[PDB]
Amino acid sequence: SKFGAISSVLNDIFSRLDPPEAEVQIDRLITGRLQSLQTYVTQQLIRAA
Amino acid sequence: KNKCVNFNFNGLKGTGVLTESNKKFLPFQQFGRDIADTTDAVRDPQTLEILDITPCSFGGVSVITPGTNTSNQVAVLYQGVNCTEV
Amino acid sequence: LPVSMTKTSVDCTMYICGDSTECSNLLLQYGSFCTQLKRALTGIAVEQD
Amino acid sequence: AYTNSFTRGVYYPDKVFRSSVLHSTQDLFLPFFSNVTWFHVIDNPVLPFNDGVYFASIEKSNIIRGWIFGTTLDSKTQSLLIVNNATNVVIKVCEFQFCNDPFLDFRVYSSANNCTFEYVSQPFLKNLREFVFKNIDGYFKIYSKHTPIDLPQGFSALEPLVDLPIGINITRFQTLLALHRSYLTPGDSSSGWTAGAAAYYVGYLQPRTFLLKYNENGTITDAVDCAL
Amino acid sequence: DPLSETKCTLKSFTVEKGIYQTSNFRVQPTESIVRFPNITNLCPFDEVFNATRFASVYAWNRKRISNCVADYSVLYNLAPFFTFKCYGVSPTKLND
Amino acid sequence: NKVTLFKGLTVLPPLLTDEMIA
Numbered sequence A: 001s002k003f004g005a006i007s008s009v010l011n012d013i014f015s016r017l018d019p020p021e022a023e024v025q026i027d028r029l030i031t032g033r034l035q036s037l038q039t040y041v042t043q044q045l046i047r048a049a
Numbered sequence B: 001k002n003k004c005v006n007f008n009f010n011g012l013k014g015t016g017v018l019t020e021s022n023k024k025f026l027p028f029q030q031f032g033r034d035i036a037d038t039t040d041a042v043r044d045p046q047t048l049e050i051l052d053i054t055p056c057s058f059g060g061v062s063v064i065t066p067g068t069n070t071s072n073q074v075a076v077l078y079q080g081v082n083c084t085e086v
Numbered sequence C: 001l002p003v004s005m006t007k008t009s010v011d012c013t014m015y016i017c018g019d020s021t022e023c024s025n026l027l028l029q030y031g032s033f034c035t036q037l038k039r040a041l042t043g044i045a046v047e048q049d
Numbered sequence D: 001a002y003t004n005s006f007t008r009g010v011y012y013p014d015k016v017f018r019s020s021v022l023h024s025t026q027d028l029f030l031p032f033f034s035n036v037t038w039f040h041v042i043d044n045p046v047l048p049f050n051d052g053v054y055f056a057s058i059e060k061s062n063i064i065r066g067w068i069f070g071t072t073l074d075s076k077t078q079s080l081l082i083v084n085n086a087t088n089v090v091i092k093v094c095e096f097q098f099c100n101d102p103f104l105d106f107r108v109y110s111s112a113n114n115c116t117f118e119y120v121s122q123p124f125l126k127n128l129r130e131f132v133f134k135n136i137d138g139y140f141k142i143y144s145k146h147t148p149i150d151l152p153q154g155f156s157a158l159e160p161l162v163d164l165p166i167g168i169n170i171t172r173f174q175t176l177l178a179l180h181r182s183y184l185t186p187g188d189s190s191s192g193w194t195a196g197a198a199a200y201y202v203g204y205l206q207p208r209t210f211l212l213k214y215n216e217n218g219t220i221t222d223a224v225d226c227a228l
Numbered sequence E: 001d002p003l004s005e006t007k008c009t010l011k012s013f014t015v016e017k018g019i020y021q022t023s024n025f026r027v028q029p030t031e032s033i034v035r036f037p038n039i040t041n042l043c044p045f046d047e048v049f050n051a052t053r054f055a056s057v058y059a060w061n062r063k064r065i066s067n068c069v070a071d072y073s074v075l076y077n078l079a080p081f082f083t084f085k086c087y088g089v090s091p092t093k094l095n096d
Numbered sequence F: 001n002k003v004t005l006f007k008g009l010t011v012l013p014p015l016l017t018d019e020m021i022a
């Protein structure tokens, strides 16, 4: 999932986008992926209970 | 091949171990997001061969100690890693 | 009656950056999320045992 | 005449290898069980090109041998020509005024014009020949499939055949016929000339979401039309 | 050493008996390889820019470039540039 | 027999194996 970014591949963004413009896209991906992992952990905790 | 190598295939940056592929790539195929939405294989721009892209071994390292109060000796466990590579 | 579930472990760095040298440094700015997730999953695994 | 397309008209949408997986793709596809116009070769009408055309033919003597695309008979419309030959297929965006009826391979029915793109490739050659044409993004994509054999129920996927960088504007298209020892003129009556028996079908693509099943050998083996 | 890593993870100079997940292990690449096409002829962008004449806005000119090496550094030789903005790609990264 | 069943995700084995539970 792109999470609103230009692409879901980090290498692509770091290749054709400058650091000033690549940083925002990387942050957009990172927040979404961290949120997904946290949701997974919360569901795992509930199912473990 | 068979060595964990950093590669750049026509701008396709990545790191992994390249090995002979058994995929039945048709002539119009250039790369394969074969299984589980992963770029399993890529076509060689020069030899036109298909190479499987595998991410070279990783794993979590766990440390076993009897306690600093007892001894400083330590044992280390490499989770999910075959001993031939540590 | 189920008694236990699978013991899952996740490498947050690899999952978020997919083993890319660039954003691995950037992910450090987000703090101790990785430690939280690892501790929660380890607790779940020990609970299964 | 009208007939339904059954499950035909599916093609590889991405040119990316996938095996032993179910993949969902949203692209221009021919909806399942759609009514497709049915014609008999024994001139065949010019038909609209709304958002992509699915073309199929069935014959045993190679009567249909080309296609033409454009917006009007005027040479200034940047028309498209695809014609088969004894040894090769010729593709040209040659913006030439076309006769009132297709020629009968009488081997040509186009006038002189100044033109920009030309290409010769290996020929695209009881029969069941399937074609798909798309031009929405500055390209003209062709997918094809040949199998021995109304349209049969057998499921099959059309592989990508060629990709023309042409950026012409298309709204209507017509097919080309063949006839032995046939006279030709810029205009002719409906009687035409004697020719072999052949049939072909035309379908229109629509934006649809499909679930494609990829087998072990990277071949699409079945599909589902979500909105059907 | 592993004991120091465990101490840092626990944030204590004394470690109790047990098994601790401290860090992760990954094999680093042994070498770097670049694979690209074997073509050698440069693109005609330089000739296009320095053409004897240019088309008008009405009935403008279109050309498609293929099968050539696009060394964009040639374009930098022209001084009196008024616009060089690019969308989707940073100009410095075009070479790669 | 009746019940049946990277990108950074792995499964750790249980301490007690099926033989010991048996």
Ligand SMILES: *[C@@H]1O[C@H](CO)[C@@H](O)[C@H](O)[C@H]1NC(C)=O
Pocket (backbone or CB within 6 Å): B045, B046, B047, E037, E038, E039
């Ligand atoms: C050069 O590249 C072309 C295009 O991929 C390929 O067909 C050919 O085999 C290559 N030749 C050599 C010597 O690498």
Ligand SMILES: *[C@@H]1O[C@H](CO)[C@@H](O)[C@H](O)[C@H]1NC(C)=O
Pocket (backbone or CB within 6 Å): B067, B069, B070
């Ligand atoms: C610490 O070590 C001493 C000496 O061996 C022992 O008597 C004591 O029980 C140990 N305590 C703990 C908590 O390990």
Ligand SMILES: *[C@@H]1O[C@H](CO)[C@@H](O)[C@H](O)[C@H]1NC(C)=O
Pocket (backbone or CB within 6 Å): B082, B083, B084
């Ligand atoms: C470890 O690798 C060696 C060499 O490939 C193999 O012979 C052995 O069976 C492997 N062991 C495990 C537990 O995977």
Ligand SMILES: *[C@@H]1O[C@H](CO)[C@@H](O)[C@H](O)[C@H]1NC(C)=O
Pocket (backbone or CB within 6 Å): D075, D076, D095, D112, D113, D114
């Ligand atoms: C071909 O070019 C000539 C000379 O410019 C022009 O008179 C003629 O109309 C052109 N024909 C077409 C079909 O564009």
Ligand SMILES: *[C@@H]1O[C@H](CO)[C@@H](O)[C@H](O)[C@H]1NC(C)=O
Pocket (backbone or CB within 6 Å): D215, D216, D217
């Ligand atoms: C894949 O190809 C192999 C080799 O030709 C064949 O044995 C097998 O039946 C094929 N599988 C499918 C699903 O077509």
